[PDB]
Amino acid sequence: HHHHHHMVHITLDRNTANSWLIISKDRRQVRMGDTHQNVSDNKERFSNYPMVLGAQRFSSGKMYWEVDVTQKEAWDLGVCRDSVQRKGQFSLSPENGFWTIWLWQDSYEAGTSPQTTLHIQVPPCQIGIFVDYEAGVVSFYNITDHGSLIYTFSECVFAGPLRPFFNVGFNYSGGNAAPLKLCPL
């Protein structure tokens, strides 16, 4: 792909984070803490899952960013409507305002309803995310495997401003403490 020149500088929005997340000072890294991180509750926070939004809102144009997932067992990544449900249980689907992929139990899936099997020969250490607002496209690329295509959501009905979306996943196994990191341009 040749999307690198639409690179945008993504930072994480602390106010949207699940209360167990630790976001780095530069707002480019997030990990699961071993306890409540001593913040007040607010209506923005994801309550049930270890999720956080980027601060950036997109309503036009072409945007590209990269996320480091090295040594993680579980994570979700992509974009979502600014207006997604924050509280309680929900599925990651375009009907609920999410355009995501994930790693779970040694398999990679796209957040369709129902979910779609991905075919990845080289486990990614970095993921590229490309959004074309006007075209209605979200695409994911395997940076570790020379930028090979992982998945394209097309005919997307965004129906609002988009935000970068992250889930560091639970760490019940003790094998998923590693952070998500926004890679430098």
Ligand SMILES: CCNC1CCN(c2ccncc2)CC1
């Ligand atoms: C058959 C239903 N399975 C559910 C549990 C596992 N899952 C994930 C795993 C990781 N991130 C998001 C969703 C899909 C829904």
